Amino acid sequence: SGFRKMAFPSGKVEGCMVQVTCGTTTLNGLWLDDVVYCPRHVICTSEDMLNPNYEDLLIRKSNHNFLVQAGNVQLRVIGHSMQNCVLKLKVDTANPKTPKYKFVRIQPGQTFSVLACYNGSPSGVYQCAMRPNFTIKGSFLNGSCGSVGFNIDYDCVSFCYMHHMELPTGVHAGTDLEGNFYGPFVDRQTAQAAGTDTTITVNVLAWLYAAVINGDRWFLNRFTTTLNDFNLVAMKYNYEPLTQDHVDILGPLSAQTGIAVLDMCASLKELLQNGMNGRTILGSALLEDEFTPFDVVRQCS
Amino acid sequence: SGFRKMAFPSGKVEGCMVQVTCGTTTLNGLWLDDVVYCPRHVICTSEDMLNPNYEDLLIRKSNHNFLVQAGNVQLRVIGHSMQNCVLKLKVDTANPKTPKYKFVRIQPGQTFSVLACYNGSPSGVYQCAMRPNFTIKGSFLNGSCGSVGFNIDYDCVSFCYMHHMELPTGVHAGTDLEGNFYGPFVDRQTAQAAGTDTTITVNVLAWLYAAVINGDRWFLNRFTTTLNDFNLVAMKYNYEPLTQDHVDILGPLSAQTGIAVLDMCASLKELLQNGMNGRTILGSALLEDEFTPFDVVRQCSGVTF
Numbered sequence: 277s278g279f280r281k282m283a284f285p286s287g288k289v290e291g292c293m294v295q296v297t298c299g300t301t302t303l304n305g306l307w308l309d310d311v312v313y314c315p316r317h318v319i320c321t322s323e324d325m326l327n328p329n330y331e332d333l334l335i336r337k338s339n340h341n342f343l344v345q346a347g348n349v350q351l352r353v354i355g356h357s358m359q360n361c362v363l364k365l366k367v368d369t370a371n372p373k374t375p376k377y378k379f380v381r382i383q384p385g386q387t388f389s390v391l392a393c394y395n396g397s398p399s400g401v402y403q404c405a406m407r408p409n410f411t412i413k414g415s416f417l418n419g420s421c422g423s424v425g426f427n428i429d430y431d432c433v434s435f436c437y438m439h440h441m442e443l444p445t446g447v448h449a450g451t452d453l454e455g456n457f458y459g460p461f462v463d464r465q466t467a468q469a470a471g472t473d474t475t476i477t478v479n480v481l482a483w484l485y486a487a488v489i490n491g492d493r494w495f496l497n498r499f500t501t502t503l504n505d506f507n508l509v510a511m512k513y514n515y516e517p518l519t520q521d522h523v524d525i526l527g528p529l530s531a532q533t534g535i536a537v538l539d540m541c542a543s544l545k546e547l548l549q550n551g552m553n554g555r556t557i558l559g560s561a562l563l564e565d566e567f568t569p570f571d572v573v574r575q576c577s
Numbered sequence: 578s579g580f581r582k583m584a585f586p587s588g589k590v591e592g593c594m595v596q597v598t599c600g601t602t603t604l605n606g607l608w609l610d611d612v613v614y615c616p617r618h619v620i621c622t623s624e625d626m627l628n629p630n631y632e633d634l635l636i637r638k639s640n641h642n643f644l645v646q647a648g649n650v651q652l653r654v655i656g657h658s659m660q661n662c663v664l665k666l667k668v669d670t671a672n673p674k675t676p677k678y679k680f681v682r683i684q685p686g687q688t689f690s691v692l693a694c695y696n697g698s699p700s701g702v703y704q705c706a707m708r709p710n711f712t713i714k715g716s717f718l719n720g721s722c723g724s725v726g727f728n729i730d731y732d733c734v735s736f737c738y739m740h741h742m743e744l745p746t747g748v749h750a751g752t753d754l755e756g757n758f759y760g761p762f763v764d765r766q767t768a769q770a771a772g773t774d775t776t777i778t779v780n781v782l783a784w785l786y787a788a789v790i791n792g793d794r795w796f797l798n799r800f801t802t803t804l805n806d807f808n809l810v811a812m813k814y815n816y817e818p819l820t821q822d823h824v825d826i827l828g829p830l831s832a833q834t835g836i837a838v839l840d841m842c843a844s845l846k847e848l849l850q851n852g853m854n855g856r857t858i859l860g861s862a863l864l865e866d867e868f869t870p871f872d873v874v875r876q877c878s879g880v881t882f
């Protein structure tokens with residue numbers, strides 16, 4: 277029993293973190309086989325950052341311009357190329373700690389583990405969700421850029437996020453490992469703001485199922501609802517719409533608990549109307565939206 | 578910006594996890610140098626858990642009775658001894674992944690990272706506090722026994738916890754790596770319950786400092802208090818006493834925020850008496866008590882390992 281915000285074991289990723297320095301800019305890079313991936317803003321001066329022409333900036337760079345350090349060892353860069361907003365540094369030696377890995381792009385609602393690093397070195401690991409507004413609520417200081425988000429399913433590590441930017445609300449923005457930003461963000465110091473964030477409804481329901489699995493029943497009620505009536509109510513609390521796909525995805529938890537998806541939607545509706553009345557669910561006094569259905573299943577069995 | 582529950586990077590510990598099997602019981606073991614550590618209840622059948630004489634059970638065991646698996650590779654057990662409630666299996670090979678480590682015993686209020694494992698494989702990592710009642714509020718299923726808790730200090734891994742049991746209340750109990758239980762528990766199937774828990778007050782203050790560092794500051798006020806007044810109220814709310822040592826330990830955060838500890842205690846006192854008044858702090862609707870002062874420092878200064 278028990279339910280915790282659990283991250284993946286960070287060992288496989290820790291083996292890939294390096295420090296990348298270009299000019300006076302030092303950030304983190306990810307070393308896999310003979311390539312080091314990093315935010316291409318590493319080539320920017322902060323004065324460059326307003327409207328950088330990354331193609332122009334890069335062509336002017338020599339290999340000797342990039343200092344890559346894996347602990348005591350400086351890696352020698354064979355070449356550089358750019359793929360969207362990530363820079364790839366080719367290096368003379370492949371990383372013997374390289375794990376089995378794939379690059380994946382995730383959808384909003386999906387969770388992953390973040391290994392926060394500074395100067396190529398791990399500070400810590402925490403769990404995150406891609407927010408509906410395509411930000412992540414992380415814990416990042418300057419120097420964090422290049423830190424990665426991943427899930428480890430089987431021995432294979434799926435890299436889904438690389439950190440680039442902190443927005444004015446304190447939330448964070450970055451790319452997949454092909455350099456494509458999540459959201460409409462751009463790697464420029466121009467004025468950008470996150471859209472209004474919303475609650476990931478399907479994850480809240482999953483977490484309510486998790487609670488019932490752990491023996492909480494207090495929030496349950498004798499009602500059911502239509503999907504439509506649910507969504508009309510949920511929208512009013514800035515909750516994401518629940519689709520039929522979401523209903524299907526919650527199917528196995530409903531089966532395991534014997535509570536129908538729409539029965540549980542009715543409980544959630546009431547929870548929004550009444551709050552918790554000084555109660556907690558799984559140790560939290562608010563409704564938790566950063567656990568997926570798949571997360572609940574993994575942790576509960 | 579941002580504040581998360583953050584575990585230590587788990588790589589150094591992941592390299593030490595093995596599967597230990599004795600009879601029908603398979604659980605996790607920690608492989609360091611030429612010794613594998615695990616709960617001594619590995620020798621018990623679940624029926625045997627009811628009443629066990631561990632010395633008597635042990636002598637009956639041969640080294641070939643214990644099956645130790647490091648992934649694909651089986652480890653050959655030279656010898657065995659018991660130390661309190663942990664069994665030590667000597668093995669032919671020393672672990673080349675062995676990190677720089679020591680065994681430490683932590684005090685209540687202190688936090689640590691748990692690497693939850695099943696069949697010797699790391700599944701997940703999370704941050705935990707030793708509760709005042711000497712339980713941990715963890716996430717553990719059957720097969721989790723032998724999973725460890727740790728802190729990383731510098732490059733040194735400090736092992737502070739090994740998992741043994743789930744109490745009926747859903748919270749968890751275990752030992753240090755010398756086999757000494759945290760709290761008034763015993764390794765048998767028998768009536769055991771967690772004592773009433775309390776809030777780790779110094780950690781709540783630390784987390785309030787973290788909030789102010791992240792610009793969450795609505796709870797700040799003009800008032801101050803005495804330790805006496807605070808503590809007399811805190812005691813009434815099932816909060817731990819705050820000592821002078823606690824105040825000293827929060828010193829750096831006080832300095833960095835310009836809010837004095839007793840100023841912040843006044844805010845906390847009001848929060849106890851009044852509730853949240855419909856507001857959240859660092860995204861939480863509870864007062865959070867599983868971040869130590871040093872945790873807040875490590876996260877807000879970005880200390881690495």
Ligand SMILES: CN(C)c1ccc(N(Cc2cc(Cl)cs2)C(=O)Cc2cncc3cccc(O)c23)cc1
Pocket residue numbers: 301317318319320321322325416417418419420421440441442443462463464465466578
């Ligand atoms: C010198 N250099 C290359 C540099 C790169 C990035 C940044 N920016 C600004 C932008 C990044 C993008 Cl993409 C478009 S604007 C960042 O936000 C980086 C950053 C990331 N996370 C947490 C932070 C906390 C405090 C300050 C930070 O700078 C933080 C500034 C300078």
Ligand SMILES: CN(C)c1ccc(N(Cc2cc(Cl)cs2)C(=O)Cc2cncc3cccc(O)c23)cc1
Pocket residue numbers: 277602618619620621622623626717718719720721722741742743744763764765766767
């Ligand atoms: C088969 N065997 C050796 C065995 C050992 C211990 C147990 N016990 C009971 C006791 C442990 C102690 Cl110490 C005194 S009684 C455990 O609690 C183990 C356990 C640990 N964590 C999570 C669990 C989740 C579900 C069920 C569990 O059994 C869990 C049961 C069987």
